[PDB]
Design an enzyme around this catalytic site. Structure first.
Site, PDB file in Angstrom:
ATOM      1  CB  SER A 117      -1.021  -0.068   1.123  1.00 33.78           C
ATOM      2  OG  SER A 117      -1.688  -1.307   1.117  1.00 33.78           O
ATOM      3  CG  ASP A 159      -5.599  -1.481  -4.661  1.00 30.48           C
ATOM      4  OD1 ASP A 159      -4.870  -2.345  -4.166  1.00 30.48           O
ATOM      5  OD2 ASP A 159      -5.886  -0.428  -4.059  1.00 30.48           O
ATOM      6  CG  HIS A 176      -5.954  -2.591   0.520  1.00 31.74           C
ATOM      7  ND1 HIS A 176      -5.356  -1.817  -0.452  1.00 31.74           N
ATOM      8  CD2 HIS A 176      -5.603  -2.040   1.706  1.00 31.74           C
ATOM      9  CE1 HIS A 176      -4.692  -0.831   0.123  1.00 31.74           C
ATOM     10  NE2 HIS A 176      -4.824  -0.943   1.431  1.00 31.74           N
TER      11      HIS A 176
HETATM   12  O1  LIG Z   1      -1.835   2.740   2.557  1.00 33.02           O
HETATM   13  C1  LIG Z   1      -2.942   2.356   2.094  1.00 33.02           C
HETATM   14  O2  LIG Z   1      -3.631   1.448   2.656  1.00 33.02           O
HETATM   15  C2  LIG Z   1      -3.410   3.016   0.796  1.00 33.02           C
HETATM   16  S1  LIG Z   1      -2.120   4.221   0.327  1.00 33.02           S
HETATM   17  C3  LIG Z   1      -2.810   5.008  -1.139  1.00 33.02           C
HETATM   18  N1  LIG Z   1      -4.086   4.864  -1.488  1.00 33.02           N
HETATM   19  C4  LIG Z   1      -4.566   5.448  -2.584  1.00 33.02           C
HETATM   20  N2  LIG Z   1      -3.785   6.180  -3.346  1.00 33.02           N
HETATM   21  C5  LIG Z   1      -2.493   6.340  -3.037  1.00 33.02           C
HETATM   22  C6  LIG Z   1      -1.505   7.080  -3.755  1.00 33.02           C
HETATM   23  C7  LIG Z   1      -1.861   7.815  -5.032  1.00 33.02           C
HETATM   24  C8  LIG Z   1      -2.744   9.044  -4.929  1.00 33.02           C
HETATM   25  C9  LIG Z   1      -3.120   7.913  -5.890  1.00 33.02           C
HETATM   26  C10 LIG Z   1      -0.237   7.084  -3.207  1.00 33.02           C
HETATM   27 CL1  LIG Z   1       1.123   7.934  -3.936  1.00 33.02          CL
HETATM   28  S2  LIG Z   1      -0.295   6.147  -1.795  1.00 33.02           S
HETATM   29  C11 LIG Z   1      -1.950   5.753  -1.902  1.00 33.02           C
END
Ligand SMILES: O=C(O)CSc1ncnc2c(C3CC3)c(Cl)sc12
Ligand SMILES: *[C@@H]1O[C@H](CO)[C@@H](O)[C@H](O)[C@H]1NC(C)=O
Length: 343
Positions: A145, A244, A288
């Site tokens: 993640s 996802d 996830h």
């Molecule tokens: O840590 C977790 O469980 C989910 S982290 C996470 N979730 C969604 N988008 C992102 C991005 C992009 C903005 C698109 C990152 Cl760069 S990190 C991240």
């Protein structure tokens, strides 16, 4: 169990100024080292970070961390749970910087919080060199993640750090799980803006070649796997569900034709971004993370599990290998069209 070590350099801190740290289980018979970056979103201004401090404090502070953690999935030392690297030296690096592992800024009279993720990785590596890592043959920097995006942002810096410290024989590789996002249009109307604000708030750093492509003001692009991956020199294996859940969340997806087409297009776009990623595992599932779950062995793409694909990747880093594939991307267009998707 992996045992907690707080960093001896106590100037490398979690968000609230408490020392960062790592959990370690050594394997004295092994020259393989797995350093895993935990995930957990991020925060990008004073108010949203203050909220996270109230109800997600373990992601901002080490004050309440337990003395031990159980390694699970790819961090498990049992071959039944972890066919891939069960005998490796195992390191779990808690995510306590809220910066997608990109920050290099101390708490101060100007900063309520410290954002030190990039420095936490560096300091963990430096302190591990005195505990056996100097003898390593492979350092796999893995993460899920926000930790998977962290692998992309930091694997080449780890490689450079070890070269500069005098360890050119350690082969640094990355395993980025669930950190490969698209800067797409939401289904109802965002990612890029919050990352752009975050990098400024955190003093966030990105890999040098990607920084030089996108230049000042545009470094947020380097948080998107398909833009940063081509700039990387270390081998990186990319694990990403085609549907996802965190991608869908940021897209405001929670089925009629418009949403059906939106979801199918998202899977097609993700699959397209992985066409030229030779080591990848991308099942057509709505889910996830993968890699620290105890049942991570269960999913298969084209009949090959992720622990097998990773083993094939190890062999490839000794021409394709017969019966031992490393590029595994589903082509079916809808979540759970792969029968092995998680329940
Ligand atoms: O840590 C977790 O469980 C989910 S982290 C996470 N979730 C969604 N988008 C992102 C991005 C992009 C903005 C698109 C990152 Cl760069 S990190 C991240
Ligand atoms: C502690 O870490 C900081 C940040 O990387 C660094 O500037 C400093 O040199 C480190 N201290 C020691 C004694 O290595």
């Amino acid at each position: 169990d992996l045992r907690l070590h707080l960093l001896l350099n106590t100037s490398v801190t979690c968000n609230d100024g408490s020392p960062a740290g790592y959990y370690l289980k050594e394997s004295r018979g092994s020259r393989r080292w797995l350093l895993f970056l935990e995930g957990g979103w991020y925060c990008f201004n004073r108010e949203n970070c203050d909220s996270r401090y109230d109800t997600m404090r373990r992601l901002m502070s080490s004050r309440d961390w337990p003395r031990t953690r159980t390694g699970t999935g790819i961090l498990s030392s049992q071959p039944e749970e972890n066919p891939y690297w069960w005998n490796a030296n195992m390191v779990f690096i808690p995510y306590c910087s809220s910066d997608v592992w990109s920050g290099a800024s101390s708490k101060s009279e100007k900063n309520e919080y410290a954002f030190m993720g990039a420095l936490i990785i560096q300091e963990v590596v430096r302190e591990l060199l005195g505990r056996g890592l100097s003898g390593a043959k492979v350092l796999l920097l893995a993460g899920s993640s926000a930790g998977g995006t962290g692998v992309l942002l930091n694997v080449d810096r780890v490689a450079e750090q070890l070269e500069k410290l005098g360890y050119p024989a350690i082969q640094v590789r990355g395993l980025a799980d669930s950190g490969w996002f698209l800067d797409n249009k939401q289904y109802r109307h965002a990612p890029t803006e919050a990352i752009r604000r975050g990098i400024r708030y955190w003093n966030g750093v990105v890999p040098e070649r990607c920084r030089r492509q996108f230049q000042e003001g545009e470094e947020w692009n380097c948080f998107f796997g398909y833009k940063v991956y081509p700039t990387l020199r270390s081998p990186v294996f990319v694990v990403q569900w085609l549907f996802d859940e965190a991608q869908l969340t940021v897209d405001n997806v929670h089925v009629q034709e418009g949403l059906r087409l939106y979801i199918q297009n998202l899977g097609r776009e993700l699959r397209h971004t992985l066409k030229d990623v030779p080591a990848s595992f991308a099942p057509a599932c709505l889910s996830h993370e993968i890699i620290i779950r105890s049942h991570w062995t269960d999913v298969q793409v084209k009949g090959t599990s992720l622990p097998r694909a990773l083993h094939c990747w190890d062999r490839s880093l000794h021409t394709p290998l017969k019966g031992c594939p490393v590029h595994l991307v589903d082509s079916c267009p809808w979540p759970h069209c792969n029968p092995s998707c998680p329940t």
